[PDB]
Amino acid sequence: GAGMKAILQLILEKRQEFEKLPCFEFVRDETISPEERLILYPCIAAFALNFRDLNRYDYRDDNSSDYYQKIINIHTQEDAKHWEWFLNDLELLGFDKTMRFSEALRFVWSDDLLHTRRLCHNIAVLSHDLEPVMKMVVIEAMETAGLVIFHALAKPGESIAKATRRKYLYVADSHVEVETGHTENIITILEQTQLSSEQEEKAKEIVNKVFQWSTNLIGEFERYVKAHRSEKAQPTA
Amino acid sequence: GMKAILQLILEKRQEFEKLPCFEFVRDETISPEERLILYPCIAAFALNFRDLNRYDYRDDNSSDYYQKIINIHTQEDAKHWEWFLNDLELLGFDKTMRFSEALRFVWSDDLLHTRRLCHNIAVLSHDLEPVMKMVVIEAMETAGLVIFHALAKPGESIAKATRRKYLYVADSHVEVETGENIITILEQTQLSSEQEEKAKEIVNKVFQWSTNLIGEFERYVKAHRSEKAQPTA
Ligand SMILES: N[C@@H](Cc1c[nH]c2ccccc12)C(=O)O
Ligand SMILES: N[C@@H](Cc1c[nH]c2ccccc12)C(=O)O
Ligand SMILES: [Fe+2]
Ligand SMILES: [Fe+2]
Ligand code: NI
Ligand code: NI
Ligand code: NI
Ligand code: NI
Ligand code: NI
């Protein structure tokens, strides 16, 4: 229908806005050392394990016989493994520092990482009463934002991986490629689905919110970078 | 109506109070440092509870009478996370560790129910009218008073033995938590049939999620029997 085609087109329009945010200009700027462009990496601590939990406990319904939910379960199973990759690159980048337990807690629950820490919370709340087809729209919008972020972060990440001869897993092309997926992708199923008028309206609200919340997270990354521009990652060769 | 909902909260409290974790915590034949082995588990909850109170309960864009008094109470409850960080240091649990060891601790599969308690309350609360939010908050505060009445027993024993001011596992926390109140307003309120059935669901959920957290605290103590508090004189 024109319903589903309007939804997928809205995700494209939001993606095109989202790709142009200042953070991503900065992350992509090869005239700044990759070490300085990845100074935002530790901020991901407020999101990456929350995302694991979103996939394990909010998206997944192991019991459902529903066609759409079974496809979600398969995809979420894989997407919930990426937090280990985050902790891998956290160490390689020199950001796995020894600190007091309270300093780690005060960092994650920083007022400067509120939108970062609440992105998966907001998605869980949006998703609580959605039928599987509508969760698929949530996941497609959220994955579209994710691919923009990690396509950008993989640029300095692959520069450091090549130079230090270390295998990066999270800020790395392998993450982008595995995430994109190539049994069927959600975007294939969505292209074969028609939405009611209510569903079409709910899908608009979903795409708008997922992109607004993702932009709020990126906003906090930009302000963290501004506060740390004299600092850099310290990868070991 | 309400009377039935206030009576279920007291029934749930009397059941909750009997959990094996609370018998362990109140056992004065066990050193208080051993009974507060569970204290660092509170890291997965205390700052989430701050956020629940700042962001999920509170609505700074409402004019409703019930929502106004909620906002007031959530203001005070949102300050106790600093007391948690105070007592963490006093008990010798503010350990130097890798950032990743802190993250792997809070996001432990053994603290799933502890970490998801506030999340579960936010999902439960997000579409509730304010009177029903008051029911969530009253049940939650009833469960919290059982826990902190028990924790303050070994807390105040260490506080006196070491002459340090404890703030979280301490009588002062139990006293300000308790001290117009929400219960006053609920006693004077008439629940429709539909609100009555939902208030029942809220009170059952708040106490089941709280029991699940307490279960994880008990399993933690058994899996870390060495890692007793190390307060200093
Ligand atoms: N790929 C990310 C998850 C992710 C999906 N969508 C996002 C949007 C914003 C930030 C992160 C994400 C990870 O493995 O952790
Ligand atoms: N008083 C607790 C909060 C609390 C209320 N109800 C609870 C139930 C379980 C655990 C904690 C709580 C604090 O300041 O952190
Ligand atoms: Fe990922
Ligand atoms: Fe409290
Ligand atoms: Ni996938
Ligand atoms: Ni392939
Ligand atoms: Ni109060
Ligand atoms: Ni809702
Ligand atoms: Ni352990």
TrEMBL record, chain B:
Binding of (R)-malate, residues: R54, R58, A78, W81
Binding-site residues, Fe(2+) 1: D77, E141, E177
One of the record's GO molecular function terms: metal ion binding
Gene name of the encoded protein: aetD
Positions of Fe(2+) 2 binding: H80, H173, E177
InterPro entries in UniProt: Haem_Oase-like_multi-hlx (IPR016084)
Residues the record lists as binding Fe(3+) 1: H73, E141
Residues that, per the record, bind Fe(3+) 3: H80, H173, E177
Keyword RNA-binding: no
Binding site for Fe(3+) 2: D77, E141, E177
Protein name: AetD
Natural source organism: Aetokthonos hydrillicola Thurmond2011
UniProt keyword annotations, A-Z: Metal-binding
